[model samples]
Target: ETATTLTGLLQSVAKTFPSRRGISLAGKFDLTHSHLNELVESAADHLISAGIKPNDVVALTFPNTVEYVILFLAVIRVRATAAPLNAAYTAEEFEFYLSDSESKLLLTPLEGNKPAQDAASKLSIPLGSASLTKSEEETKLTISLKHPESGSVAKLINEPSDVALFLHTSGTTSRPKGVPLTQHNLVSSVKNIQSVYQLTESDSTVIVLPLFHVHGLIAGLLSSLGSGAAVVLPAAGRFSASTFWKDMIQYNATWYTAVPTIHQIILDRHLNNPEPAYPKLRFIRSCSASLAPVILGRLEESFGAPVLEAYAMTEASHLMSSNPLPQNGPHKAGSVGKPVGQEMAILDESGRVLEAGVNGEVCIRGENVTKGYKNNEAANTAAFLFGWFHTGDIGYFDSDGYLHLVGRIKELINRGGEKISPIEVDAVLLSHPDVAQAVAFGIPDQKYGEEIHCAIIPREGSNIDAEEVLTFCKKNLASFKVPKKVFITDSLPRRLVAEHFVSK
Candidate 1:
């Protein structure tokens, strides 16, 4: 990776594929590499004219679209730190982000993001608004804005030591922390992911992940663009399984990335009737959530492509561990595989490194790791022990070096004297024939400090009895691992932000 920061990365790619397609939204006029470079230049000019300086924080809130990409790249090109907030944040959440990040300039659309507008109004700051990624008519509005000369703009001159992006740790709790990822970290992560996936300039990738999050920003967008590959975006305001397949065939896309639920949605839709095959699609990558063994098996069998499951978080520059491409060496089905760019080790409660197969908090250290949380000394102290960043996830490395995630350290259930990993219970429940999705959490219990409880979203028109699920667990797992209570739900309640708890 020649570019330590985002601007250097874009410059390198633009030099390589100046006119190649960069972003495709709705199969319309694709945002070619030349157009993307011009947009970044324009954004840099506007930001400098608006009085932004080096190291100044610029907050962005937008949906998953091309405009988000432009503004995001623009921020990096000018050497300013970009703090992206979830578009679905509430007014209160927006206020917290604005105050926490201490942002001067707020960039967002005029509509569909009322919380951003409200937060800007409450903070009494000037908000530069843009429309959704579609709405080509809004381009006129953006063009009319005054911009500074290229010579007068804040030139991108920072070295690898400068911070490029500040993403808030997910969840709306008061314990929120801002992860400051430097340009070196992001570039390292992008190169690491691209190398592991064996990406090439000829590869076309359909990007559906939102750009505000690290998963979408680094892995999905930067990885492809930096490699001079094609990035196809779905139609604005809609994400359909059929449309995704259409683009895959239309662009002859070599790969696509998505969360586990997204893959499940497509899998469920295709199970009723076989979807058109994309002979060119090389592989499907899954992250953000756990990928079930059954789903992985079905994906490989139906799509004729390997499923590369990954483990990532915002603090680790979006990617830490991922399975290699199909043509590479051995690929594990259920494990997240070994660390891709970062070093991983299991640590006991006392911060001592544990032996292989010993369950403990997953600690990581690498250039892709964040510098530290912004302005939170307590959080920094808690998250970093010695120098390794504590991932708060409970996992162990097998003798073969593959990492197996059991559950979050805090989410483990202590029933009487037995410890239960919620993910273990979830895997067992999901293995049941009638079960579709299962999430386990601990509930208050007087007898046991905490007891195992679960919520399940069963298959359509399929009834799943709690006792029957327990019976299946009896055959597959130990009695202590069985869920004590199970509640059936139509669907799991989810928030847009990463790391937020799913209602189970």
Candidate 2:
């Protein structure tokens, strides 16, 4: 039977494997199916007894840990919406998110996160606390909710249409918009990911991405658990290259998913210090950001496994397309692969579908896609058209039906009348041996409307000058596509959660 709601999915997994290992943290904390079931039930009971009602918003501010996962599932199980915020947010950011989400309760670490605590106090929202402690040998997880004097009976949410998760857009150029995802949307996406990866009960994944992001929440955690597999979480939210391989070996992790930067760090460590052959790893998945072809090839060579690149967005419940396993199909190097469970197309400016190989805006439609943004009619109207959600990305399909992302429509650089994709310049710069990382952006130019400007981080101990970078670009790119100016930097700015390049 197909499970419509997350609760139903959990129930089905529990019935089939009640004693199976469901979750573990740094080889310290371990939970079986029965243990997870009891923990969720108890947390739900506490939330209900504390006056948390159906449709109420419960905000969570914590790092990636087992405690956050338990509270998140419990909040949804009791019919309330769970909104997880980035722990690195400032008090002002927290205030905005809490007020915007209309959160009635805020959960933070028992030791107290000052920014979140201050924001909760300012908003007059009740605060809850949880403790997740780990020593060398063991880990302990506990939660305490402060009940109001007046409380209501607990109610189970059976409807698949009810909203269970609330997240905010990255808001690069504008204010962040609220995204509310229903149980049906989440379950469908989880199923899609499970099918794409062929996950099974024997599979175990090591999670290093932040849980607050959809990539880690849906693709990393839920997909594994929904398939009756175990998830190994690090004790701290941080990813350590020194300890990462050892942890994976200790847990016998079959697979793992991370962003491109994390993969690069691990690859660098492996190249510096080669380890024994890993017998348990089946594959490595990269998402949330574009993976350079060079890095992808290096990862495959070093790990001795297939490197699959997946395309996802917060509004799509995490996954829209992914490279199929090597055994199932041929995976392309630069392409993001075919749609897993969604309908994808390229649409011209007039909303007409373009033929394969035509460059246009990428659009998608499916059960996994969100209906619309919460209370933002302007955004909804601009995003949805002709029964398709415009992805704001400029791309096209290949002869093999693979999706190739050119660049973001808003980020294109215009030199006079000719348009250049910044992604193209970035790729050329990244191919250089001395370049460690590169980002291309448009700079204001009176003559050309917009000129290409690139920031690059050179490899450690490499003295690559801007002139050298320009020479390399001139050799590879067209005259107009060459960067008008190149600035070398030690590091590039990134967002709080993901490692996406931030333009200065």
Candidate 3:
């Protein structure tokens, strides 16, 4: 049975898999299901000792590790909201998030992460240190309250509707919007992902994505753990293509998930020095960005496993749709698959739902979706209408009921009276042999209102000429769709988040 709350979910896992390995940090630490329960209880005790109250928001900043996973679960277990901030954030960025989240407490490493420490100091929020020390017999992990005289402890939280996690938007176009996900939202999303992937006790996933993002927290970690499965956390804080295969084989990992950029890097590494496919590997999951069909086909062929692309967002609690397993149905390469646990539709500017084959904004409504943005009435008013949350993506449903994304509505290029999709141009350029990565954006033009401009990163050791790329685009795309200007560089500009390209 699926648990409706984080507390219940943890209890259920412990009951079912008491001796199974619940979480393992490749070579550093491994916690059994029983050990995980002990850690959660210890963490809750520490939070209570620090005078923390139910529903209070606690900011967490740590590199990808087993400690992060335990602290996140413990914070929520005690009925407090866990706001996991990016470890790479600067002091100014940390201050903005800490202030925006109204964090009552800040949990950080004892040594590094100076910016987070500075932000907590500026906010006057009590700081706590989370560390792990080794003894002769075993390793001991601790979450200690730095100041014990601040306040008194209160009753712990035990409600399904209580907010368990708070995350902010990427703030690409505007200020970051606060997204408060309740226990119900997180549990529902975890169940949906587990069902879609058919995870079981025998399954193990190598988690390489950052823990702050929804894709990593909910889909990669929570979903796997909630399903009586094991999660292998690599020792390196970041993804290393050279060690990915060896780590998976070392842990006997059955599956893994990551964004398209990570997948492309893995693919390039594999192509350079191929390895035998692991028969235990079930499938590879891709999300958080568009996966080019060219890359998708090659990845599946090279990996000897299916590559499932999922569509997700922060407001949706991570996953909205994903391609089914190969045994269940036909897995399309380009499509984001069908809706998993939500009602999905295409809505026009007037808020009328459109039929299949019509391009419009994608809308979704479900238990996993957030009710509204925190403290942003204007954003809520614009986002939710007619009981459906409008996702700002432009996409259409095929006759087969698969969703095909065109591009972000705000990212579309208005060339005079004609509109063009940057995604379409990106696909064409990515298909070129010389190009390893591509991003298409609209450049301002007086005569045409807007013109297409593309930035590309060439494959290693390939000297791709601008004229050759332009000629290739001219042959494949329509005159208006072809890029008027091209910038070829060793690397393309990316945003703070994974695989998010920025237009300059």
Candidate 4:
């Protein structure tokens, strides 16, 4: 398949499929490709009217609203880069990102985040914050370019290689790092996923993942639009089984993509209920978290559609590997399948590549991989050791070439001299009949340097004692791999709501 640039792809959709539904804000409010192109063109009009030249860095901090999507496309139409930050960040965090990105203008929400407003004030950025109630006001608001020093400057100055997005990595590490994805990078990702998935104008997707994430932005929304497919957005930012299924049927959605937890919720809520007939999707796609084999089996039985699990990270433009389409090859139940558009490898501790079936650090090398972490030389040096992006995830490939993720490197715990992967413990605990969710962490201990601690959320109305849990663990796992202590909690810590209960 021939690859098209971002502008070229969008223009193709707008020109060829103007009457087809291109974007949907929630299931009820839909925008055709013609409408979407008009909105984006209007955004370009506003930017030009305000004297903002092409290539200006427009910093955006908004929730999963229609404005977020429209503004993003508009900026790209003019070849300007859109630097979107997490709306949930604190003042210090916001300032650090804005300053680091050298943002030209700042956009904030009018309500709830006073710290964001304060940060924008400190940076002397022209503020365009809006509230949910005043969303229409923000839409009508335009930038003013009349300045004493500069005349009206309106021109599209972006190129294929020019940066189109400045996305920050989820701060699973110490500090969040920005990854600059050029138009070329984005265009490559969209084209690659579209070709692999065989998306078309007739295909429709229900999107519940947050737009701030690269998975939602590039892989979910952009990929569909690039292929002239319709996108269905959920009304609520959060996912509810009733709302999701209802909307899916309402829109006659053919497919949807979400993290594992979303699918788990649907499975839990609708396990016994008769499957709805209206919005029978061709397939359901899973990403962001590892899918448990049990969950995968449950999804297939419940939905009667194959759950296509994919492996992706923020640094790799959101997608690395995915299950092949049915027409292309056979589907593997537990594996993420093969790399889609990038080179994948398993590397040993000495940075040497490993053979199949041998566990090691998962390394990626390709156009999809980021050049390096922005402004973090230390991380760059460590991550880009041998011309590969060293994904801290630990996994290996099978003889058939299907890739499986074992766990994260940092999540590994060393108790005295014994090395334990928390994922192993979590998997064992989840096997128990009464265990609904489990998270294994390390706790301080004098003798063991660090001890394994397992926190579990029991199934509703069920009682599972810590000692009993430990007994089950001992039977299934080695003594060192067993939990040293157990803590019962209502929920585990998560950045986004997803089923991280599985071994990542």
The backbone clash count of each candidate, in order, is 0, 0, 0, 3
- Residue lDDT tens for model 1, 1-504: 367675677778888888888777767757777778877787677778777788888888877767777778777777788999777666755787887888887887655467777887788756776542436454322521223223355335767877788876632232357788887888888888888998777888777677877877798889888888888777763357778787777887888888766787778877876765556577789887667788889988888888888988888998888887767766687788889877898998788989998899999999888878878787778789867898888999988788888877554565543446666567668877789998877764543535676788898988778888877776655566577767777767611211233344
Where does candidate 4 stray beyond 4 Å? 1-4, 109-112, 129-157, 170-173, 272-278, 410-504
User: Per TM-score, what order, best first?
Assistant: 3, 2, 1, 4
lDDT tens digits, residue span 2-115, model 2: 999977798789889899989887857678877787777777777877788889999998887778888898888988899998776667668888999999999987777788
State each model's CA lDDT, in order: 0.75, 0.81, 0.81, 0.73
Question: What would the per-residue lDDT of candidate 4 be over residues 1-504, giving only the tens digit for each residue?
Answer: 344468667877888999998977664456788777877777677655544566677788877766677778876777777888766665665677777787776665544356666676798755664322225344343433213123421455446676788876532353456787877788888877887788899998777777777888888889999999988777765455777877777777888887766677787778556554535567788877666678888877877776788887768877888888777876686688899878999998788989999999989887777777777887788788888888788898998788998766655565543446676567668879999998777764544545777778999999889999988786556577688777787876621222332234
lDDT value, residue 340 of candidate 2: 87
TM-score of each: 0.78, 0.80, 0.81, 0.76
Worst 10 residues of 4 by lDDT: 144-153
lDDT of prediction 2 = 0.81
Clashing pairs in 3: none
lDDT for 445 in candidate 4 is: 59
